[PDB]
Amino acid sequence: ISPIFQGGSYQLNNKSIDISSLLLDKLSGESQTVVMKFKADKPNSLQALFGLSNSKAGFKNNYFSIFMRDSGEIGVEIRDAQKGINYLFSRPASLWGKHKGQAVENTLVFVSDSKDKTYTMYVNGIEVFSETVDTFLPISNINGIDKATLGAVNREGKEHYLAKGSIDEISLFNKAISDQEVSTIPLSNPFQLIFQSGDSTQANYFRIPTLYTLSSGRVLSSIDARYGGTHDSKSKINIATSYSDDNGKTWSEPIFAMKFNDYEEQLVYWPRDNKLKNSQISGSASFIDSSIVEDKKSGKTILLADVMPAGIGNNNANKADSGFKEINGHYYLKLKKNGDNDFRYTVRENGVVYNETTNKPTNYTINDKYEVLEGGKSLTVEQYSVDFDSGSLRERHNGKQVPMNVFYKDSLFKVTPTNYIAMTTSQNRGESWEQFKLLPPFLGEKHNGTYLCPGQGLALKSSNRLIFATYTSGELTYLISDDSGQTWKKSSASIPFKNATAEAQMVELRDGVIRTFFRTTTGKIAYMTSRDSGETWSKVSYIDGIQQTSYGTQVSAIKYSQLIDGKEAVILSTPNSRSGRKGGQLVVGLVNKEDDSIDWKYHYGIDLPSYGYAYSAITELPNHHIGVLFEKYDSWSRNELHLSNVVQYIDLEINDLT
Numbered sequence: 001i002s003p004i005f006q007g008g009s010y011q012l013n014n015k016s017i018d019i020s021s022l023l024l025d026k027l028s029g030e031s032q033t034v035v036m037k038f039k040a041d042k043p044n045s046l047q048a049l050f051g052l053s054n055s056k057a058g059f060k061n062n063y064f065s066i067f068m069r070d071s072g073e074i075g076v077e078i079r080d081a082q083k084g085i086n087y088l089f090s091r092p093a094s095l096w097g098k099h100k101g102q103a104v105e106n107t108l109v110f111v112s113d114s115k116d117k118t119y120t121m122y123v124n125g126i127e128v129f130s131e132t133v134d135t136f137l138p139i140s141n142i143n144g145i146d147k148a149t150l151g152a153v154n155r156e157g158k159e160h161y162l163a164k165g166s167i168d169e170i171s172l173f174n175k176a177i178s179d180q181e182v183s184t185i186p187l188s189n190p191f192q193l194i195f196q197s198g199d200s201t202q203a204n205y206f207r208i209p210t211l212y213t214l215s216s217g218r219v220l221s222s223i224d225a226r227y228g229g230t231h232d233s234k235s236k237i238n239i240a241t242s243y244s245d246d247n248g249k250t251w252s253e254p255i256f257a258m259k260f261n262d263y264e265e266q267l268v269y270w271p272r273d274n275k276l277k278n279s280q281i282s283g284s285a286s287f288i289d290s291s292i293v294e295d296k297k298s299g300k301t302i303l304l305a306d307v308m309p310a311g312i313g314n315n316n317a318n319k320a321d322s323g324f325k326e327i328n329g330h331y332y333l334k335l336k337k338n339g340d341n342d343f344r345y346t347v348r349e350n351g352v353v354y355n356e357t358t359n360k361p362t363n364y365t366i367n368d369k370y371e372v373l374e375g376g377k378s379l380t381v382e383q384y385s386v387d388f389d390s391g392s393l394r395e396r397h398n399g400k401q402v403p404m405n406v407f408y409k410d411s412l413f414k415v416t417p418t419n420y421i422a423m424t425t426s427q428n429r430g431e432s433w434e435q436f437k438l439l440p441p442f443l444g445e446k447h448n449g450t451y452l453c454p455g456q457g458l459a460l461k462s463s464n465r466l467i468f469a470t471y472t473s474g475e476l477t478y479l480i481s482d483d484s485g486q487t488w489k490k491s492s493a494s495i496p497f498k499n500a501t502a503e504a505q506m507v508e509l510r511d512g513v514i515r516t517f518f519r520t521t522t523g524k525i526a527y528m529t530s531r532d533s534g535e536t537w538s539k540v541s542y543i544d545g546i547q548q549t550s551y552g553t554q555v556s557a558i559k560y561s562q563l564i565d566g567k568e569a570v571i572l573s574t575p576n577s578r579s580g581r582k583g584g585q586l587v588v589g590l591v592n593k594e595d596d597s598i599d600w601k602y603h604y605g606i607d608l609p610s611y612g613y614a615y616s617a618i619t620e621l622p623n624h625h626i627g628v629l630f631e632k633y634d635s636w637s638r639n640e641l642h643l644s645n646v647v648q649y650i651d652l653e654i655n656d657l658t
């Protein structure tokens with residue numbers, strides 16, 4: 001259908017524009033579609049882009065508006081006092097502000113559909129909310145509407161919610177256009193999606209992006225595919241990967257690097273209301289926090305992630321137990337059988353389930369996939385699905401049998417409810433992944449395992465050494481391999497923190513010299529240095545010029561291949577803010593060859609200081625551009641839980657940063 005109204009190049013400079021006579025008499029019927037292309041790179045705290053209102057004395061609460069906040073939140077109000085209706089629908093972190101220093105043209109599509117009684121909002125090709133109501137209010141059936149306004153709402157003759165920005169284009173339709181029609185609307189997005197709702201993972205949520213550039217020129221990415229909202233474990237979460245063979249322009253359909261099957265992979269719209277938003281899938285095993293490295297010697301790609309048995313996150317994870325029993329310098333995975341109060345079993349060589357009380361092997365073995373066999377026959381359990389049909393979260397059996405796994409709730413043999421690290425490998429650069437194996441414990445039998453630092457591991461340039469950073473209370477624990485990940489040793493480096501989430505990433509400044517940047521609890525990013533290829537580590541220093549919150553955020557970091565202003569350069573990705581996870585920056589640092597100190601010279605603002613930016617991944621693409629895959633929202637805020645399609649990818653060039 002053709003628009004009933006179309007207009008453009010409106011400048012909103014804290015003064016509303018009246019389009020009443022152009023628009024009001026064109027509106028008819030009960031369904032409408034608003035299509036608006038708009039910029040706001042210096043928005044006011046709260047502003048209305050578009051308004052329909054009764055502007056008369058005593059009808060201040062009779063209006064329709066599309067508003068935004070300087071946080072990047074978008075929403076609408078639909079209000080009619082006589083009908084007793086005050087609808088308010090919105091979603092945080094829905095907008096872009098600036099990209100490469102230039103105001104982004106956001107494409108907004110709002111559908112008001114009387115037949116389905118549903119209001120639906122899209123921004124930049126992403127559905128950010130879809131709300132169905134009992135009593136529908138057509139946007140132009142509001143009692144006494146007499147104004148159509150851009151850049152404010154006229155209430156009782158005065159300008160409310162004054163906007164600063166521009167509307168390059170606005171169209172209205174006397175129809176609710178289909179989802180199909182919406183998808184044909186052209187966009188000017190500054191970003192791409194690698195992982196997204198409805199893709200092959202069937203996760204509606206994603207967190208913890210990684211990026212790594214392989215020797216073939218393929219760029220590889222991993223991520224938490226999170227099913228039970230954006231919650232950290234306990235939940236259901238898989239690790240998914242995707243790769244690009246054209247310098248990030250296009251990405252493959254995701255596959256899983258690590259997955260469990262005890263719960264269905266379901267795309268669920270997780271509740272965002274204050275009563276139900278902390279609902280959490282509580283009986284599923286999960287993975288969380290992945291990291292990637294490539295091994296020159298073998299050519300293999302290697303991916304680690306934390307593993308959690310059913311119902312377990314770092315919160316309720318059994319500290320003081322590694323989940324392994326030591327017997328003669330050998331570590332064996334412990335198991336507890338259905339009905340026993342203690343762990344009477346261990347998994348010995350050839351997965352033979354061994355009975356520690358009577359020292360006899362049993363007829364049970366554990367296969368490669370940590371699945372349980374009896375006399376060679378595969379045991380099964382019934383899969384669970386989740387739903388909110390009853391009004392609260394329900395987890396229930398769904399009729400499907402899946403292989404019985406020792407990380408499962410319904411398993412006859414269960415591992416220790418604590419956190420593990422798993423490793424998997426790919427021989428085809430991320431086209432398929434092997435079944436994972438658990439790493440051994442590194443800090444002793446009666447210590448729980450360390451926590452993987454998400455992002456990249458480090459492959460030293462001049463050797464076969466592979467390093468993955470992990471953290472635990474009081475130290476960074478570097479995992480080191482010189483044989484393609486077949487065996488690992490620890491290098492402990494104490495840090496001045498108890499119970500920090502010391503997420504650490506490394507760069508090799510020069511042969512043998514590793515600088516590690518890490519999250520702390522001080523509001524500053526810390527670093528330490530090894531001149532030892534990771535054998536030994538310096539004391540801890542802190543970076544000036546960048547602020548974090550008290551709780552901190554993951555920082556990603558690379559050593560750039562080309563010189564900048566004649567110097568070797570390091571690039572940091574982090575939010576820069578003492579208030580929240582926002583104000584995303586790439587910070588370019590030039591190395592001083594004399595002492596390996598770093599002058600943080602250029603700060604590139606990814607988007608507005610007020611717009612969200614949390615965990616991030618950065619890599620130098622083969623063409624020397626920079627790829628950034630990041631959480632474009634505040635992943636700490638309890639107001640921004642369970643948002644879809646907020647982990648986004650951008651391409652930058654060095655000149656943009658400087």
Ligand SMILES: O=S(=O)(O)[C@]1(CNC2CCCCC2)C[C@@H](O)[C@@H](O)C1
Nearest residue numbers: 212213456459558561619620621622
């Ligand atoms: O130097 S590596 O550590 O092997 C690595 C890639 N270097 C190429 C060099 C050639 C240009 C693209 C990047 C940097 C890490 O951030 C990973 O992306 C892997």
Ligand SMILES: O=S(=O)(O)CCNCc1cccc(Cl)c1
Nearest residue numbers: 232233234288306313314315635
């Ligand atoms: O700073 S955040 O809260 O956004 C994310 C911190 N995740 C830490 C963690 C690691 C492994 C398992 C679990 Cl359950 C939690």
